[PDB]
Amino acid sequence: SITQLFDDLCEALLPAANRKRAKRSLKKVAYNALFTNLFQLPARNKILMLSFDLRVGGLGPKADRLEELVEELEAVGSVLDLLVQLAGSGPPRDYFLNNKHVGRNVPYSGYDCDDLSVFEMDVQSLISREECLCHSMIQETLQVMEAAPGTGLPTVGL
Amino acid sequence: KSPNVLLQNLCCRILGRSEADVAQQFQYAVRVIGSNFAPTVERDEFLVAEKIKKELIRQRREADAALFSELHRKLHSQGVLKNKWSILYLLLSLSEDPRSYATLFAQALPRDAHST
Amino acid sequence: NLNAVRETMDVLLEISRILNTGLDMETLSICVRLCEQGINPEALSSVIKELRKATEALK
Amino acid sequence: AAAAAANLNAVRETMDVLLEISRILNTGLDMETLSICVRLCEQGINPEALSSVIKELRKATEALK
Structure with a gap:
């Protein structure tokens, strides 16, 4: 069909x-x-070239997952060759993370200051989201409240 | 080019194969290079130079230790190389002796003292 | 067999979710079954990006 | 023109000097492989990581030969 x-x-x-x-x-x-x-070229290699660009900008385990599925999808090749083409077209917690204070046998590390530095950016993005909302909520309605009489109103456009 | 496509040419130079053949190794090369991209030690070509002379002197090859000093200046004379520390740090590591302890001698700075 | 072809179709959704492809669950089974016919996937990358383009001109 | 040919000369020089430092240090590299490792090191990449790879792919090409 x-x-x-x-x-x-x-x-x-x-x-x-x-x-x-x-x-x-x-x-x-x-x-x-x-x-x-x-x-008007292999298949799995094109994923790794996208797996690389994942690990560079952080988020390692997600990249270790993308390769974890294509390894079990072997035991169809032309389908994943279609997804890698649309990779950029899409639209734009866990306490057992680093947490050196919980474990069975946690190894000696010494201070990191590179996990706490990426644990205050996890919070700074929160206060910067709930602030753009209040910038995109008082704007979407003040652009109509103060204008010429009858612009944003749809019933007056009849 | 991009470093991801460029890493695959390397796996085809060392191992003589096509990119459709060798893909298990290239899976291991993305694991190591990735997540280890940023340089970890402060960069200076002075310290790496005084370690390639100290190495060619240790092999009784005192004549090539004074020839390198004339080849390392020419690199600065032309000026098409941005990171001269990296390519020397690598050429030193792959060096084999044609024919111990290193916590005593000079090592590069850690970069942990700074708030990276 | 339909149990196997369900799992193989369920795993394939995730690798299309973390690769940030807009394909939802319905359009995936359409495209998987259509690729299963034997059409070349280099062309399907263009029809979806154009159907999504003419769809935006309406809104 | 000219400034596009003066750059192709100043690169064939440096790629010829780095090949001299490469032989007096007795790295097994050659002129073709060495141009790949230079490009990588320009973008910024750990030479402690990149050299572990070359010390491995050369260590596995023998198990296959």
Whole structure:
């Protein structure tokens, strides 16, 4: 049902509410764009090149997880080759973290000051989020409260 | 290029293979290089120089210890190299003697004293 | 077999979640089954990025 | 033009001097491999980490030979 699997795909990406002619026109954009590439390298390596860029900017264990799944997905190759193409298109606690004070046999470390320095940035981002909200909540409504009479109002636009 | 694609050329130079063949080693090279990217010791080419002379003198090769001093100046004469400490720190490590204790002698500073 | 092809499809969602791909659960089974036909995946990367483009012009 | 050819000369010089320091130190590197390790060290990378890798891939190419 390859002629239908493109028809069901065009429904999901259609945002819910003419919804009867847009699907007819969006199926054109699906075909008008599918045959441009057709007119005109291993698989796991492309993940590692993205695994590297993970570890550099921190978040090591997540990168050790991305490789943990592709190792069990072996025991389909063309599917992961599609996900690596859309890697950047997406939209933008645990106390048993470092916590040298809990464990069975925790090894000697001495002060770190590189875990407490990335434990105050975990808090500084919190107070900087709940402050942009109050900057994006008093702005979205004062831009309407003070304007020309009848701009932001939809009933006056009739 | 980027360091991630560049690390794979290295695994194809040392091991003679194609990138579709050798992918277990390149999985081990991303593990070590990554999470160990930032330099850990204060960088100075002076200290690394006085350790490549001290090493070529120790092999009774006192003539090449004074030739390196003339090759290390030319590097500064041309000026296309930004980090001269790194490439010497590496060339010294891969050095083999054609034919003990190191907590007594001069070691690089730790960078832990500073608030990195 | 449907128990196996469910697990193999469930693991594949996570590697598409941490890779920050916008594919939700429904569009994934559509694309997995469509890639399972034999279409070249280098082209599917363009239709999804364009369907999402013309979708934004409406809003 | 000219400033794009004067840079290709000042790089073939330095890549020829670093090959001299490489042989008097008896590193097993050659002119092709050494140009990879220089590029990496320009972006900023731990030479204590990068040299552990080369000391390993050269240590595994023998188990296969």
